[PDB]
UniProtKB/Swiss-Prot annotation, chains A, B:
Major subcellular location class: cytoplasm
Subcellular location: Cytoplasm
Record-linked InterPro entries: Thymidate_synth/dCMP_Mease, Thymidate_synth/dCMP_Mease_dom, Thymidate_synth/dCMP_Mease_sf, Thymidylate_synthase, Thymidylate_synthase_AS
Function: Catalyzes the reductive methylation of 2'-deoxyuridine-5'-monophosphate (dUMP) to 2'-deoxythymidine-5'-monophosphate (dTMP) while utilizing 5,10-methylenetetrahydrofolate (mTHF) as the methyl donor and reductant in the reaction, yielding dihydrofolate (DHF) as a by-product. This enzymatic reaction provides an intracellular de novo source of dTMP, an essential precursor for DNA biosynthesis.
Catalytic activity: dUMP + (6R)-5,10-methylene-5,6,7,8-tetrahydrofolate = 7,8-dihydrofolate + dTMP
PROSITE patterns for this protein: THYMIDYLATE_SYNTHASE
Protein family membership: Belongs to the thymidylate synthase family. Bacterial-type ThyA subfamily.
Keywords, in A-Z order: Cytoplasm, Methyltransferase, Nucleotide biosynthesis, Transferase
Record-listed (6R)-5,10-methylene-5,6,7,8-tetrahydrofolate binding positions: D221, A315
Record's protein name: Thymidylate synthase
């Protein structure tokens, strides 16, 4: 079945995943070096073995393409994936004047009442980002996140480079180019930023009139992250294909450190006892073509009949 | 056998390699997305099915580690791999006053007498690089080549960053880090340089006290290039392992566009009918440890009993 590579990867780190300790103090089972191939012509690879929220993926991806670095847009679409970082920033800001909030991720998970103070303080912040233009510009701006990295790579000579916009014109004019690469890995910022990008670099390849994309992902959360990671780059693949009047080949996913947090073994095992279903079918708006000006309504998912979602603790 | 992954990759692009046209006007058979795993504990992966020159690899690698960008060092060790680029540069230089020399790669290959003028003019240049300090500094300096990219990545604030030197200290202090990445892909220079790096980015991974490395290679010459490409990164892997008092795991080779030039089909087919042999054993100098100060004599290859070399035309 289409998602089988995913189930086969989860399966394997259960068999050969040696125990690896890590940054987030929650143990992991790890493997290094892996590759998955998805034929995007068989269907859209949104896992059917567990409900995964397309909405979060769609808004987030668009956010990237727009060249956005501001949380505001996401909240504006009920997307709270990136909040934690914009919050962490304001909480350190001297202007912040409230409860201790230190290590809030760890502390909330281990304290029912602290998690209460946290969520109230957060809702506050998110509203302030949404309403205070100045506040937004100050704390709603992540800065060095994919959208900037893809669409505005700052040079040494001050100027900015729209990698992704140049790679698409390079594909329109030189499909057969072996240098259709886009990178999110800047040696200059990498040691200072909080979360160096997970999806280090991706590459395009056009042959037979079909476009495929390879993604290099240095680190990976098998249960909570890969399911999304997949549909984010498989969606990008159609989006570029649509823009370039091209077909759709494969989404090839290469991993560096693929891992399974110890606190997710029972969850992965249950999902593993599930039996896949036919894949959902992606439908992009025919008329509209320049993908950067796309909005939620232009990408339509069909026939997604998932299994019930599976809840699990995060690693922090 | 150890090199079997290599023979299995060459084999496959013969079966499924669709025809892809390219920059070097010589047709290719191509595949996109592939991965090979080599257990460096079984032996050093220098192909036994065809003599490959370790000397060229060893000098070149050291050249990289030294942070060198100057051709002089290589010539000084009879290594002429990079000449063509330093030559191309001088030939365009107004100071150059000799024969037409345009498209010399194509023109020499297709003209016995032109190739004569070329080789005489080249020997000249190489000597001038070796003897004229000023000439060397001016034309013997490639500038943006791995050695600089690895060991001196220019920032926007002028300063330089020794990625590789920082990654090794990061491994000495944080083996279990999922961010031990080194990149040669700079979005800022990439569109101007002649040959954007082939070996885009590599990553380290330490587990069980064994160090492994994954390399992402966007483009690849299966017959003439991969054989080298392999021993260059498998050697780097021991070199870092030695420096860090670590063991040796696997060398994982992930490819983007792997290809076989049409003008090499008979050559690859003959090699394919060869039967591998036990692998050569790499012996690094026990006393010496800081790999950056290494010299040819510190790395010793053993038991390399190759088949006769196989000559073939290059692609230009
Ligand atoms: N969509 C996501 C979000 C996060 N991660 C995870 C993987 C690691 O758990 C951490 C990234 O690695 P590091 O901790 O070294 O920064 O983030 C992931 O794979 N996919
Ligand atoms: N050691 C080497 C030297 C060269 N190449 C080849 C692969 C391609 O033929 C070209 C690089 O890609 P591009 O032409 O897109 O720059 O150089 C390679 O694989 N290995």
């Amino acid at each position: 079945m289409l998602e089988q590579p995913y189930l086969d990867l989860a399966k394997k780190v259960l068999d050969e995943g040696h125990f690896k300790p890590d940054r987030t103090h929650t143990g992991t089972y790890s493997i290094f070096g892996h590759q998955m191939r998805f034929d995007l012509s068989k269907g859209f690879p949104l896992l059917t073995t567990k409900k995964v929220p397309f909405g979060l993926i769609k808004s987030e991806l668009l956010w990237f393409l727009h060249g956005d670095t501001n949380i505001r847009f996401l909240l504006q679409h009920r997307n709270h994936i990136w909040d934690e970082w914009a919050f962490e920033k304001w909480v350190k800001s001297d202007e912040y004047h409230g409860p201790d909030m230190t290590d809030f991720g760890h502390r909330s998970q281990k304290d029912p009442e602290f998690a209460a103070v946290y969520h109230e303080e957060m809702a506050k912040f998110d509203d302030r980002v949404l309403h205070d233009d100045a506040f937004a510009a100050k704390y709603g701006d992540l800065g060095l996140v994919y959208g900037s990295q893809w669409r505005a790579w700052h040079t040494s000579k001050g100027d900015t480079i729209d990698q992704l916009g140049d790679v698409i014109e390079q594909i329109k004019t030189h499909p057969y180019s072996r240098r259709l690469i886009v990178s999110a890995w800047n040696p200059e910022d990498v040691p200072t930023m909080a979360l160096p990008p997970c999806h280090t670099l991706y590459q395009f390849y056009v042959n037979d009139g079909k476009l495929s994309l390879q993604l290099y992902q240095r680190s990976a959360d098998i249960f909570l992250g890969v399911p999304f990671n997949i549909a984010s780059y498989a969606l990008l693949t159609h989006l570029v294909a649509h823009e370039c009047g091209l077909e759709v080949g494969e989404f090839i996913h290469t991993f560096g450190d693929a891992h399974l947090y110890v606190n997710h073994l029972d969850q992965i095992k249950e999902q593993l006892s599930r039996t896949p279903r036919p894949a959902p079918t992606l439908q992009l708006n025919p008329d509209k073509h320049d993908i950067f000006d796309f909005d939620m309504k232009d990408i339509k998912l069909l026939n997604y009949d998932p299994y019930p979602a599976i809840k699990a603790p995060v690693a922090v």
